[PDB]
Amino acid sequence: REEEGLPGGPVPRINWPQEYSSFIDREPVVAKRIRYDTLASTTLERDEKQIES
Amino acid sequence: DIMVPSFVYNKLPVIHFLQEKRAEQKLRRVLDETYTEWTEELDQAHVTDAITRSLNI
């Protein structure tokens, strides 16, 4: 995933165009988009060399 | 020269048998005290969850 440049973190299988339609208020939808996009832009790993010590 | 030697000779087999049994008992006790210690370590999923929370996500 890092070689492709794909976002290290997991990405849910979502279609936001459907979500922006389903929900009536944009606030929860925007917040949901805030979280996942932040999640996908972060590397969820720990240097295990340090953990092993 | 005659009597004590004969009685020692008569003693030998039983003592040998009992000492062999005693050694087997020692080995059995050594084996019986062996237990494998399976340890439990904090799941890393919680650590990942804490990391996410610290990010304010």
Q: Which residue of A has its CA nearest to B50?
A: A44
Which DSSP state fits B39?
-
- Best residue of B42, B52, B53, B56 to probe chain A, by most A CBs closer than 10 Å: B52
Q: What is the resolution of this structure in A?
A: 3.7
- What method did the depositors use to determine the structure? cryo-EM
- Best residue of A35, A45, A50 to probe chain B, by most B CBs closer than 10 Å: A35
Distance separating alpha carbons of residues B3 and B6, to the nearest angstrom: 5
Pure H helices in A1-53: 16-22, 26-40, 48-52
- The dihedrals phi and psi of A45, each to the nearest 5 degrees, come to -140, 160
B57·A39 Cβ contact <8 A: yes
Please report the sign of the dihedral spanned by the C-alpha atoms of residue B18, residue B23, residue B26, residue B27: negative
